[model samples]
Target chain A: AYRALMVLRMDPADAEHVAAAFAEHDTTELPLEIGVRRRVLFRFHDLYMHLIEADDDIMERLYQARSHPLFQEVNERVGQYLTPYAQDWEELKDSKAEVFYSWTAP
Target chain B: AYRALMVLRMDPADAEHVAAAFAEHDTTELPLEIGVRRRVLFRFHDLYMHLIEADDDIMERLYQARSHPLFQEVNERVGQYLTPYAQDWEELKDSKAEVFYSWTAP
Candidate 1:
């Protein structure tokens, strides 16, 4: 699956609030519409990692999601708990981690 | 890269114990021996996910690790907090999540 990891740093105490915010949003439809197969959010201490596994169209659909109000709403609400790793991030792709060593099982 | 997702359920309260167990182990050498390029552990509440990004030889190396006492030690120690998704788990591979939809950027 096409995998994207979005890195964010957050206070561990605030994780519940973040989780609750995510709970409110219906994350199911967005990815399904965008051709994403699986999405998961993981936290390790202060690091909150969002992983998206999708089809080849993900990058294209992600670009499309930028214009949707659904994306905008979640973006605004979730932004409170999620801190971008880079302060200068101007786009969703900017929050993505560059693959240093990438491979796929045949 | 060979990607593996290990699923485990744990009481969030014991997460610190699990994290401490991982912290004490110098995970660098073990992966190097088997050609694992990256390792990340993530938790979404009770769902503790262990992701292993490695080379194709990982399955082969994983077999070798089965024989090593070090692997056994971690397996045994960490086993306390990590509840296998399957109660009938027999092998390390049993904990792995099967890739349903797969893709790569290129």
Candidate 2:
């Protein structure tokens, strides 16, 4: 079994739309092998690229967009929702959006 | 390795049953295209329906379900308690009443 890890962001801004987009990617956009159990990739993103791994609480982490400690830090710094992860991280990098896909497990 | 990601809701009033139900699901039902390596899905929820994905952890983070975490969160808050991943996760998701059948790879 292979494991790939990455980060990502939603483009349409609507939660449902974002979810649908993700569904599309997983169901069709991403490649799946005919033979061999394909490698799987899971993502975890934060507010900023550098701040991505800032929480350091590896043992008690969940998937949150805003509560991310680093995202919160940037929010306090910028006085608003600073969409850092939205910019530099995504599952589809070449798609010309603010998102990041760290590894494909190649 | 196979891969899938999705969320679900369990109806109940308490935590133990919740975990039990989740464990039940993991142990019996779901699907796989081949010999699955890992298929992990984590969801973070909040007070409002729209307020989801509060966090996403795939790296060195210990998994949490919620303060009232389980059924699974008994594992963190609004977290990825009932993951359904590779190995144990995949095995469990399809651990339901009748989660399987196919042309190959069991």
Candidate 3:
């Protein structure tokens, strides 16, 4: 499987709401549309780390999902709690240039 | 360059000191030993997201760095603020089986 990490810095005060929204969203049938085998979210201070494990072409579908109303709804809700990191989500969303590395177990 | 993302959850109360430690650690001459071209740390809520961009064999060097006294000192200091995520870091250290995916810029 392919894995991707999307980073964001959140507004700390909204942690509770964001956590609730994420818990609710996680339970839904998001996998059917996104082809994401697993989605995990993590919080560190005011930062948001999102991990997605899926098939190779999932990024293409993720772009398409960006505009889908269903996806947009949740995105908008989560967006409220987010602020820019060194670079904002928009910049990160376009960061296809970075090289990610991994190694197999013995 | 190769990129690796290390995720950790930290005690919210220790955020300030941890940030200081990270800042101090980042400014030193660490590149001399680890072959890490760039290292950046991020915080989201209570999580720590560390990104390292380095030469291909840097992971090997990182494994070696784990036991080096200078590296161990910071690692031990940072360890104090961290908690286990879906899996603890020791588990993650051994998680060489996971596939990390990346794409080049268009």
Candidate 4:
């Protein structure tokens, strides 16, 4: 899948954390407003978290993204779009919602 | 990606039509009220249509689903979840919107 523009943080040196964090983040859904086309945007980071084994890889990516502050800003800013929704849902459930995007195919 | 549970229906005997109908439907977003986890639902029928050559394959599958009346009912009923939203979006767009899922990855 071609993603519009996403900037991931975390040092590749700590790729393990990066991957785990991504895996963890993937476990949650953060709806972004802009993207390649669909109004509701999602990325792999939104789907996967950093696995212990993937930390080094994750850190390397984080390092690369960090080099460009703009990417960092974009990364954080994207999450901003989901803040309100997350807060509302959190208040309602007192926890994050585990949302996966898929329907049925018989 | 592992999908929770998605049920699609179409006359396998007319798999071409089934596949086309499904492809057309997949091209849109249908938010469901119930599911395994995170609310949104989607399926392969939500992704691929019958290629001209794949028509035979589509028909075969459609026939299988049609063999079971319940599957047919479920297929049509599932679309009910999107009727209101589709109407609203249609009235607003004056044309159907092409919505694809996938955000950014960088």
Candidate 5:
């Protein structure tokens, strides 16, 4: 499994709008191979994140998703609520947080 | 349920030593009240975090755990591998990353 935290900036008030948009949208464009097990958005102050727990190739699949019409629609609708954490964020990897240490109790 | 991201700083090379210490130790002092369903450590550069998913009263229980002998031992054992993310961090709340937005698939 792989996890990615795509960081962003947003107003807390706009959370519901963003959440509802994802709730109503069809996310199948991600394809079965992507296999998203968990998807959550978190906010702290002006900081926000789109956290994804998925298959190992999720980043590659997500990059490919950029061209899907439905994906573009979702991005457009949610764009108003999101501000890129990095100004020059072109690659999905740019928004991804690196994990240097990880532990899970058995 | 409650989730907390306890931020800290640590060298990535010490991951095995830290993980081994916890593996050999017993963590039952947390009590049934804490109900830790998930516990994980993640590192990014000099940033590391102890992520906990547990009962809503987890922070309160954790505060009380500070006085437990085993807890003290665990802290002392792992202390060398950790550096507080905030020097003046006195409260558990200070280390937690707030959730501004959250979503789950239906």
Candidate 6:
């Protein structure tokens, strides 16, 4: 399995809209090969963290998800809400690597 | 409930030593307030992703854990293995935020 802890951000005021989009989107229709076992969004101030787990084909899975209208709309709106930020410490985007530890709550 | 998906990188050769340190460390003795319920480390190439779950108060928890000799040694050695990188996209270090989606594997 593979996981991506995608770090992101948005205007604090759009949190409610973000929530609504999540509720309305129909992710159940996503393909089995994309195999998104879990997708969770967490917030801390203006920062939003997306923890996504899949069956090791994360790049393709993301491409497929973004291809769908439901996800497309959600992603578009999310992009609008996003505010720019800088990270001089670790250029996670450029690395283009993905992996995660398997942690199951007892 | 809170979680931090810390992104890091280290020399690939030290992965075995990192494993040994984890094996030798006794985290059971850690205090309850700085409650660390789960911690998992994943590797993608040279990058190490640490997924840590705790009962809130993560900064203090990290502080307390680092105070212990075992953790201190582990932290110091791990620091030595670290290789600097840059993140020009998102400045996660400056945010000082913490939150996560509760995902319990079935």
- Every model's TM-score on chain B: 0.79, 0.22, 0.76, 0.23, 0.81, 0.64
Native contacts matched by each model? 0.00, 0.00, 0.00, 0.21, 0.49, 0.40
Q: Candidate 2's residue-wise lDDT over A1-106, tens digit each?
A: 2222222232222333333333343354112322212222222221111111212332122233336553443234432322423333442222111111111111
Q: Name the better of 2 and 4 by TM-score.
A: 4
DockQ, candidate 1, comes to 0.05
Which regions of candidate 6 are displaced past 4 Å?
Answer: A26-34, A43-47, A83-97, A100-106, B6-49, B53-63, B80-96, B100-106
Q: What are the per-residue Cα lDDT tens digits for candidate 2 across B10-92?
A: 22223344344334434432211112223332222210000111123321122221222223432333233233322334432
For each candidate, the DockQ is 0.05, 0.03, 0.05, 0.13, 0.39, 0.26
Report lDDT per candidate. Answer: 0.63, 0.26, 0.60, 0.28, 0.65, 0.56
Per-residue lDDT tens digits of candidate 1, residues B15-93?
6667666555544366566776666666544556677776674776686677688787766777887886567878766
Ranking by lDDT: 5, 1, 3, 6, 4, 2
- Whichever of 1 and 6 has more lDDT, that candidate is 1
What TM-score, over all chains together, does every model reach?
Answer: 0.51, 0.22, 0.49, 0.24, 0.68, 0.55
Please list the residue runs of candidate 2 whose C-alpha ends up more than 4 Å from where it truly belongs after superposition: A1-9, A12-106, B8-18, B28-41, B47-106
lDDT of 4 by residue, B43-78 (tens): 121221111111122333333444465355446644
Global lDDT of model 2: 0.26
Question: Against the true structure, candidate 3 has what lDDT?
Answer: 0.60
C-alpha RMSD (angstroms) for model 1: 11.5
Best by TM-score: 5
What residue pairs are clashing in model 6?
A86-B91, A87-B87, A90-B86, A90-B87, A91-B86, A91-B87
Q: Which docking category, incorrect, acceptable, medium or high, applies to candidate 1?
A: incorrect
Q: On TM-score, who's better, 1 or 2?
A: 1
Q: What tens-digit string does per-residue lDDT give for candidate 5 at A20-89?
A: 7776563553434456666766665555666666658578768777777847877788887888666777
Better candidate by lDDT, 4 or 5: 5
**Comparison by TM-score, 4 against 5, better one:** 5
Task: Point out the higher-scoring one by DockQ: 2 or 4.
Answer: 4
